[PDB]
Structure 1
């Protein structure tokens, strides 16, 4: 066992999933730090250094990292793989990014199985000497992810179907909302420039009042202020922060992809009184 195979990922969700597949035979690191906004992140010379010293670079694609393709052109002789191949996308419904794929495919545990398979295939292709470890680790991790779905689905099924409105800040939850039968309301369709402008807040306030939706949420890499303004002006309580674009730090409450899915579903369910 000389040097560990080095994988660099764009952001922390892919880092944790890939590290579960790498296990003992590769080290995986994320370019963005926990809590950093990932869509419009601005890479630094230090990020170039980290990617250039990797053996493999993984990214989401589906229009998540607006920075990645320009950044990767600086990187020489380091293979990359997009980890969302074979996932059917949901289009963004409104705004200047209307009609392109919603990048947040990982919030569906069924989709996470495809992420696992795509990351396995890339490690097996570019570090073939450890293919058996990658294959074993991916099989074990896919088992955990697969088993993850049933308790989540049952938990959220307790909410009456006609009351299943998921009101958030970024429209980051489209894939989870589809899986578990939630209607989707958000203050902005995808992180970009306009985030909490009028018209956006007003439309959400109208849908809240018309349907008497009981809770609204923010997310861990963006500002909670638009969501708290919406709850102050309506009957809805502020449900707290969901995790979608970043894990927490390793010593925080959301250190892993599994903990992120569980925490986000629990926080939603609590916002509806379980």
Structure 2
């Protein structure tokens, strides 16, 4: 066991999934820090250094990392793989990014099985000496992720179907909302320039009042102020922060992808009174 194979991912969700497949034979690091906003992140010369010293680079695609392709052309002779191949996208519904793929495909546990398989294939292709380890680690982790779905599905099924309105800040939850049958309401369709402008806030306020939706949420990499303004003006409680675009730090409450899905579903269910 000389040097461990080095994998660099764009953001922390992919880091944790990939590290479970890598096990003990590769080290996986994320370019972005826990808590950092990932869509419009601005890479630095230190990020270039980290990617250039990798043996493999992994990114989401599906219009997530607006910085990645320009960043990756600075990198020489390091292979890359997009980990969302074979996932059917949901289009963004409005705004300047309307009609392109919503990147947040990892919020569906069923989609996460495809993430696992794509990362396994990339590690097996670019580090073939360790293929048996990657294959065994991916099979074990996919078992965990597959078993994850049933308790989450049952928990959220407790909410009456016509009350399943998921009101968030970024429209980051479309794939989870589809899996578990929630109608989707958000203050902005995807992180970008405008986030909590008027018109956005008022439309969401209107939908909450018409349907008496009991709760509204924010997310861990953006500002909680728009969601709190929405809850102040309506009958909705502020349900707290959901995790979607980043893990917490390793010593925080959301250290892993599994903990992210569990925590987001728990916080939603609690917002509806379980």
Report the TM-score, using the length of structure 2 for normalisation. 1.00
Q: How far 1:24 sits from its partner (Å)?
A: 0.2
1:219 and 1:257 map into 2 onto residues whose CA distance is 15
In 2, Cα distance between equivalents of 1:4 and 1:71: 24
Partner of 2:27: helix, strand, or coil?
strand
Question: How far apart are residue 207 of structure 1 and its match?
Answer: 0.1
Residue by residue over 1:95-147, the C-alpha shift from the partner in whole angstroms, topping out at 9 and shown as x without a partner, is: 00000000000000000000000000000000000000000000000000000
Deviations 1:28-64 (A, max 9, x none): 0000000000000000000000000000000000000
Q: CA deviation at 1:172?
A: 0.0
What's the secondary structure of 1:89's corresponding residue? coil
Aligned to 1:142: 142
CA distance in 2, matches of 1:96, 1:215: 27
Alignment RMSD (CA, Å): 0.1
Task: Return the offset for 1:192.
Answer: 0.1
Residue 6 of structure 1: aligned partner: 6
The Cα offsets for residues 52-93 of structure 1, whole Å up to 9 and x where unpaired, read as 000000000000000000000000000000000000000000
Q: Give 1:174 shift.
A: 0.1
In structure 1, C-alpha distance between the alignment counterparts of 2:93 and 2:272, rounded to whole Å = 25
- Superposition deviation, residue 206 in structure 1: 0.1
CA distance in 1, matches of 2:42, 2:231: 32
Distance (whole Å) between structure 2 residues aligned to residue 226 and residue 81 of structure 1: 36
Q: What's the counterpart of residue 164 of structure 2?
A: 164
For 1:87 and 1:162, the matched residues in 2 are separated by 28
The structural deviation recorded for 1:181 is: 0.1
Give the Cα separation in 2 of the matches to 1:217 and 1:19.
Answer: 29
1:2-33: CA deviations, max 9, x gaps?
Answer: 00000000000000000000000000000000
| Deviation of 1:258 (Å) | 0.0
d(CA) in 1 for partners of 2:223, 2:149: 29
SS of match in other structure, 1:240: strand
Q: For residues 163 and 117 of structure 1, what CA distance do their matches in structure 2 show?
A: 35
> Whole-Å Cα distance in 1 between the matches of residues 233 and 105 of structure 2?
32
Q: CA deviation at 1:158?
A: 0.1
SS of the equivalent of 1:85 reads coil
